[PDB]
């Protein structure tokens with residue numbers, strides 16, 4: 001289908017993968033700090 | 046082509062216009078600059094030659110799906126509409142030159158401009174057209190050729206004008222530029238402004254011309270201090286201090302000069318800020334606005350009305366857009382808008398504080414706008430431009446620093462485990478406090494456990510210390526405190542030395558690189574400034590209101606001939622210079638040698654035949 | 661294009677020009693000898 005073809009075309013482009021990866025990476029750090037500064041406790045995780 | 050002149054035009058054969066008409070057409074369609082030059086050189090009546098049908102043929106000869114074809118398709122050449130569209134809808138040679146430019150036949154255009162009439166005006170016009178064409182060109186490679194050709198014309202136009210300027214200063218400068226152009230209405234300079242012909246404005250002649258317009262009727266050599274004394278002593282103008290009914294004529298001459306309007310405006314602007322601060326720091330109160338606050342509101346309203354006039358008289362959408370283009374006009378608009386919000390919030394019963402806050406920021410915008418003054422001085426204008434080009438380095442430093450601050454800030458906070466752990470404070474200790482450490486504010490007693498009391502705060506296992514700082518956390522762990530100090534050492538090393546020094550290195554390199562271009566850019570922008578103040582009403586902003594309320598042939602033939610003669614002389618000198626260059630002499634010398642070798646062979650053959658006949 | 665560019669360089673023209681001169685000098689000598697022989701035969 002044309003719609004599916006365009007969808008993969010956009011989401012398969014190297015740039016979009018890069019940007020998508022970057023956004024995920026930032027959230028990872030933000031999650032990391034949240035865990036490290038607050039959620040980290042001697043109790044079980 | 047050399048063969049044709051050698052053989053077809055050896056002189057042994059006559060020729061006729063009709064004979065050469067077909068060949069000329071072929072050369073034009075096939076882009077044969079040498080031939081078209083040669084054919085015209087042979088006494089061809091171009092004016093009687095060109096026909097509208099032929100002209101249509103040329104345009105039809107555009108290459109395949111060339112950009113020009115797209116414009117023609119969207120647009121019987123109908124060229125006039127095309128140009129009117131490209132610019133914005135604000136003698137055979139001229140037509141041929143226009144045609145050559147559209148098809149990007151560099152040599153063809155170059156030759157036609159040489160035979161043209163309005164050489165200087167045409168040169169800039171070509172420079173404008175190509176740059177617009179290249180910007181719109183999608184090929185992304187033809188644009189490179191168009192950009193190159195544009196530079197060639199601009200370089201040629203400036204070279205010609207310099208010759209004209211030297212020959213007859215008053216003649217060229219005044220009449221040759223200030224006059225209205227051909228194929229357009231905006232003066233010749235405006236064409237340069239549209240084309241962003243940095244080099245052209247960079248020329249000495251125009252700069253001298255602009256300076257003359259900048260000072261208006263007053264002599265361009267008037268000392269600045271002398272102007273200031275005159276400004277504060279209006280009667281003083283009539284003395285011999287300023288070099289240029291008679292009294293009224295002189296009065297308007299002095300007060301109408303662009304420079305005096307600028308200085309008068311600057312003095313008013315400073316007083317505006319001084320009034321602003323007086324209101325902001327003292328007179329601002331929750332009570333209804335006082336006398337001064339009202340005066341400021343009226344004063345600001347005058348600024349708003351003034352800036353409105355600028356945009357309204359920069360094609361409503363066209364003039365609005367170009368007015369918005371100027372960065373300073375953007376600064377004015379944002380400044381005024383914030384001012385309205387401040388007053389609006391100020392009047393509302395419940396938003397007095399918010400009103401004051403936004404005004405304080407607004408005042409910051411107005412003060413920053415004051416940097417426009419430094420764009421006048423020739424030793425500061427270039428500096429301001431260069432500063433604009435440093436933003437690339439600053440952003441690099443910020444992003445690099447921002448990464449490091451997050452890396453160090455979070456790690457330090459993680460080790461300490463402060464008990465406050467309140468989100469606003471967390472941000473303070475993660476970003477703020479580390480940031481200040483760059484500038485010598487290093488709170489050792491808030492991070493080094495050795496400098497803090499030991500006390501029991503939380504039942505959590507491990508040891509704890511009580512920092513004295515109010516925002517340093519009630520109690521911070523001390524498990525691996527040596528690591529915290531170690532990071533502090535690393536952080537200072539990286540941020541406080543490596544990055545800051547690296548930034549200085551980038552500025553040193555960037556400043557050296559863009560010093561040349563920045564100087565040209567300022568010189569070009571100098572015109573835009575002068576035009577802006579040339580049309581501004583004489584009175585100052587606080588009193589500008591009244592001005593707003595009050596607001597509510599053969600010589601040309603002689604001039605053109607004068608232009609052409611210098612162009613012809615300029616080309617001949619350049620062409621002769623080429624012929625006298627070493628390489629050309631070497632080429633011509635070698636050819637003569639071959640001719641000599643040829644005759645030597647013939648002589649040698651003659652001797653042999655004579656020797657045989659000696660019997 | 662590169663090879664032609666080299667052949668059109670100034671140095672190469674100078675080299676080729678000098679060689680042609682020597683050839684011209686050679687023929688001049690032969691012509692000079694021819695004139696001498698003809699002059700002798702003029703008797």
Ligand SMILES: [Ca+2]
Nearest residue numbers: 352355374377
């Ligand atoms: Ca303005």
